[PDB]
Structures are given as C-alpha cells and as structure tokens.
C-alpha cells in the first residue's frame, strides 16, 4: 500500500535554569524507528527498531549531528518568538515541528510536508506546492519574509522529493518483514447487561497494524449512530493498535445489530454479530 516517513520534534523552554527539553522521534508509517531525548545519557540518536540497527556508524554519527543542530535551531527560535510576541522571560513556551513525505503503492513520491507550531498553534507551514509558506499571523509573516529571502523552501523541497523518499524506500526494503506486513484486526464481540432488558454490545478490534481502521454499527442494515460510543484508536504497547465500538440495544434484539470492520489487512470488510452464548 502507501507509506510515509515522518519526524516529530518538541522543544520546551525551562526559564528557571538551563536549556530547553528537546525530544525527537522518527516514524515509518506507524512504527517508531529512532529517537533523541536531551535528558537521556547517550546524547546520540538511538535505534528503536531492529531493521535500523543495520545502519553503520557513519549513519549514527550523521543523524546525531543533524538532530543536535535541530535542537539548537529550536532553542534560538524560542528566543526569537518570545521577542516577536513580547513575552516575559519567566514563562515556559513550546515549539513543535513535523516534516515528512508520502509515497504511493508504487513507492513514488506523492506529497511532502513541513509544519511548525508555537505554544500549540499553527505558526508557519510549507504549502502543498513545496514552494511557498502559510503564515498564521503577523509574527509568522516576519519569519516568512526571512525564509523567502534565504531560499529555505527550495532546500526543503529538494529533501522531501529526494533524500526523504530515497531513504524511505531503503527502510521499507530493509525492514520488509514487519514494515510491509499488514496485521488484520482480531475481532470479537462482548455483551454487558445494563438492566434486565437492555445490554451493551461491544465490538473489539485488537492487535492490528497499521493504525488506520473503521468500525461501524448497523441496525437491520442501515447505519446506526444513536446510542453508540467509539473510543480513539490506542496503542497496545507491542507495536499494534486497538479499538472498540459499542451500542446499547433492547435485550432480545441483538441479532438486528451488526458491526462492520474495514482495514488494509482484510481482503473483504468483516461483519460481526452477537452469538447468543457467551
């Protein structure tokens, strides 16, 4: 199917003493594969997936240099934006950055992105053309004029269409045994009486990968949204994901209700019905 490579960066200023807290993570699809944490002892970019440990020491040296450079950029930006917004030196503030590329089922470039936030709100982002900038306010407009003058978008476009997609294809090949394996949802239904004449039916999807999934309830084959509840997809902690959906029904009427599961690992969508024995 389609695939993505993304890097996430967070820096949080510490006005009381010292440098910002900086955390960086890299993902292929929904799999974390590298991390850097300024509070950790190594002060190196570190592996988090077996297939990236293949890479030699020149890789780990280069990635460590680049991620520390990112951390200093964030440190400088925190100071610059505090000035733009006329904020006190006493408060803590946050900068966040995300960038990456998507490729299609043919592993060819589909789109790239590069976005920046200050205190949890959009600040500046590269447009989909990878040539111009969306500035959310007049402070960001100032940054936009500087980045136009310094050819910044050109360098980001070159990376997103070149290096980013080339190494993504390299990772997809080296980590083939997991990165190109789909794990279909293991599904089952549970039944919880809520009174002597109503019950909750809960439809479970467990141990699936990637995280994208749709769970929907139908009653006599029409969609059902009244009296349903859907939890956010959540990590199992072993690299796979979990989700459930529930509906409250009159006791005795369970056979009217069907749960429908769509996922990349399923040739055909699945249909589940309560089996009158538990």
């Amino acid at each position: 199917g389609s695939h993505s490579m993304r890097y996430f960066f967070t820096s949080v200023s510490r006005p009381g003493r010292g440098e910002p807290r900086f955390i960086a993570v890299g993902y292929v699809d929904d799999t974390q594969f590298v991390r850097f944490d300024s509070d950790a002892a190594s002060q190196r970019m570190e592996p988090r997936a077996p297939w990236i440990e293949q890479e030699g020491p020149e890789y780990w040296d280069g990635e460590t240099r680049k991620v520390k450079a990112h951390s200093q950029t964030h440190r400088v930006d925190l100071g610059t934006l505090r000035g733009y917004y006329n904020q006190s030196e006493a408060g803590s503030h946050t900068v966040q950055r995300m960038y990456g590329c998507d490729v299609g089922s043919d592993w060819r470039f589909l789109r790239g992105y590069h976005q920046y936030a200050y205190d949890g709100k959009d600040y500046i982002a590269l447009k989909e053309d990878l040539r111009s900038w969306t500035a959310a306010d007049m402070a960001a407009q100032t940054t936009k004029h500087k980045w136009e003058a310094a050819h910044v978008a050109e360098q980001l476009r070159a990376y997103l269409e070149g290096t980013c997609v080339e190494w993504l294809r390299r990772y997809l090949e080296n980590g083939k045994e997991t990165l190109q394996r789909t794990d279909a949802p293991k599904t089952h239904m549970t039944h919880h009486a809520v009174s002597d004449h109503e019950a909750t039916l809960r439809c479970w999807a467990l141990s699936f990968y990637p995280a994208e999934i749709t769970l929907t309830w139908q009653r006599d084959g029409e969609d059902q949204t009244q009296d349903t509840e859907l939890v956010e997809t959540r990590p199992a902690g072993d690299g796979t994901f979990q989700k459930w959906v529930a509906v409250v029904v009159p006791s005795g009427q369970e056979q009217r209700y069907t749960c429908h599961v769509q996922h990349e690992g399923l040739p055909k969508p699945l249909t589940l019905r309560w089996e009158p024995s538990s």
Binding site: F8, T10, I23, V25, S92, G120, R202, A236
Partner: protein, 99 residues
C-alpha cells in the same frame, strides 16, 4: 491554548485473572506537554512504570503511553492517576477489563 488530557486505561491483552499482562494508561489530546501520570494498585503508586517518547497529533496536541506488567485478580484494584495544569485535582480512572 490549554487542552485537558483524555485518558484511557486498559490491558494490552484480553484479561484473565491470574495470567500476567500489561497495564496501559494512554493520555492524549493535551497541551502543554508537562504531565504527571501514575499507575495505581489498590490506591498505591506502582513504581517500575515506563512511558513512550513524547509525540503529537495533527492539531499539535500531545500523547503518551505509560505501561507496566501486572497480573489481574478478582481482588486487586487498578487505576491511572493524571495531573495537568488544566486539572484542578488529579483525575483517577479505574481499570475496567470490559473497556
């Protein structure tokens, strides 16, 4: 921009009394990133708890997974306790194996 955490407490595997498992507390949707998360057993803090590396969603809100091994029983109470700048008091969500 202050956004309060959403909390889910659950097991990694379908729970069976007496069989070891992993207890998860997933906190998401919050800003700023500083947050206190404890896993509790019978009201008391479990002490070897690990957590994921901080990351964030489309709207820039943060998410973290806290986790530890545990063995469910008929007798023990498990829960997640969360404190954040947006919360007046720590929020306690009890583990229910049906959810």
């Amino acid at each position: 921009i202050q956004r309060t955490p959403k909390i889910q407490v659950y097991s990694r595997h379908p729970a069976e009394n007496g069989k070891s498992n992993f207890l998860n507390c997933y906190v998401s949707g919050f800003h700023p990133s500083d947050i206190e998360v404890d896993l509790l057993k019978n009201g008391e803090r479990i002490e070897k708890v690990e957590h994921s590396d901080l990351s964030f969603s489309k709207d820039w809100s943060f998410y973290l997974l806290y986790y530890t091994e545990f063995t469910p029983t008929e007798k023990d109470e498990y829960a997640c306790r969360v404190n954040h700048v947006t919360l007046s008091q720590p929020k306690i969500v009890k583990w229910d194996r049906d959810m």
